[PDB]
Design a protein around this ligand. Sequence first.
Ligand SMILES: Nc1ncnc2c1ncn2[C@@H]1O[C@H](COP(=O)(O)OP(=O)(O)OP(=O)(O)O)[C@@H](O)[C@H]1O
Lengths: 134, 304, 159
Amino acid sequence: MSHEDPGNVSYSEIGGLSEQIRELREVIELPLTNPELFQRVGIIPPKGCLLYGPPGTGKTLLARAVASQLDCNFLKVVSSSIVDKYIGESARLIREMFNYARDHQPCIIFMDEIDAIGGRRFSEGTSADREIQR
Amino acid sequence: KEQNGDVKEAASILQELQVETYGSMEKKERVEFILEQMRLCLAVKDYIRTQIISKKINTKFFQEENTEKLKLKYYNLMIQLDQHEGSYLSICKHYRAIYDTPCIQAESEKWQQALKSVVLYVILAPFDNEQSDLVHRISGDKKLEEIPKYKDLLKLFTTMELMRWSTLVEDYGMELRKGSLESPATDVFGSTEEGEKRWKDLKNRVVEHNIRIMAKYYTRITMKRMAQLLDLSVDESEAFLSNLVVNKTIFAKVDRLAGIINFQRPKDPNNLLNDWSQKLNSLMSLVNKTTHLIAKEEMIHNLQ
Amino acid sequence: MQSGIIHAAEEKDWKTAYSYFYEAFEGYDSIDSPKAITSLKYMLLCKIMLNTPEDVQALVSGKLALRYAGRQTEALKCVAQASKNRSLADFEKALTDYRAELRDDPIISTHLAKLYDNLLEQNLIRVIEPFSRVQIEHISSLIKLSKADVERKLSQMIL
Ligand SMILES: Nc1ncnc2c1ncn2[C@@H]1O[C@H](COP(=O)(O)OP(=O)(O)OP(=O)(O)O)[C@@H](O)[C@H]1O
């Protein structure tokens, strides 16, 4: 909860892609400010979103700017926190994470470099390949 | 309003009502609009739909603190639908809410007839434990006893006993020409079919009320005595006792061939009868023993 | 549907007989109306065969039965209502106007004779319940029937 993103101004300086920003502004900000519009239509608010690169760049910047624009609460997690050396209990630390996500809600959570922690276990091998699957 | 509407035109607005309920919140004007179609639904003659759209109104309640006083005047439209067909009890609790409009009044004639309208449905409602404590809330009021017919009304309820039904018609048959207030009798006797159904209702209520004391006082009775007691033929008594036995409100066995009829006494062959009776009676003087003990103990210490 | 008819002539299982007609109606729904309107008659009648008229009104009150409501569903509701009210006179009064729908019953003798044998004691439980000692001649006037077969049926009720 100690992550610091400058801007504000930095949010105005990123430029492209405009319409992508106009998608994320909505999917992120609208469900919080106007939950009433969703319950009328019957549409469920999207609970997740995927932003990938680098065909171009600007992923982390843009989302990080939303943290400082929407204000409210923001939570940043580095992908290096999943291993925990022996006893991969950090898996249950995800349950802790979602515990306080249910307390401090609303909140925004970032997941960067998910390919290391969300791989496909295609070739069964070594050891820690499996713990990540857990 | 152009074509004055019909079954189809009133149905076009129906599907459009709920479109803006979840679209936006409007305090007053919308409510006034959402009650506009049911008053046309009475002219549609279809009641099963009128009760659905009226079921959308109750979730909007409580509407008080806004208007105040107009929406309290709409209940006069709702009681019309509820009083119509199947329920006399549904108007019971709601007429105490239509009684809150003369509370702000500032009006005498409307209020004075509001009291009779709220007091006379007790007979039209089937007896229930909720009715018992319902009538006690209205009893004892300072404004209520102003009506002399209210003393007759109350007399039939308090401690029961018996009365001639024709002498009852002497008091309640004058109220048609009497008035001042003719509105309660305008609802009862306004429609010949309505008035007749409430005549048989009053009869059913008085004969049912004569029964519940007989149920506590018997023991047994001759059949022919109940006929002269209820001022009707024995065949009519057979009909009455058939409905009372299928309502299983009171168990009885009434033998027509031998003339011996009775309500209860419950069988209770051995166990529970002697158990409760004998034992609790014996415990009376036992638990009262220590009670009068301290009575003499204090009296003797007052003078010594 | 045929599974239902054969089970109705077999009379062995009155439960699954309603299940077969229910599924058959699920097949006939949304495509062919004439088969869907005639499918409800058998399911509701087999529920009357089970002596459970209370659930009939609950099935016809759903939004699915309102589109298919018609002159036949009132003939089903009136048999459910006469069995609930336990009155043969109302049943016979409605039996003449709905006889056009009564002829579609493949076997009119089975359901009517079993229902008559049933409604017999459903009319007896009203006259018997109020008092234990009862004369046969005056109580037979309510049901309007000779005393012979009546005593035969009562003794059967003891058996
Ligand atoms: N739209 C933009 N406006 C301003 N600076 C930008 C923009 N896009 C990228 N940058 C510069 O790129 C740097 C990193 O941003 P970003 O998160 O896009 O890199 P990245 O996604 O890690 O790149 P890659 O995915 O190739 O590793 C920032 O320091 C910023 O100065």
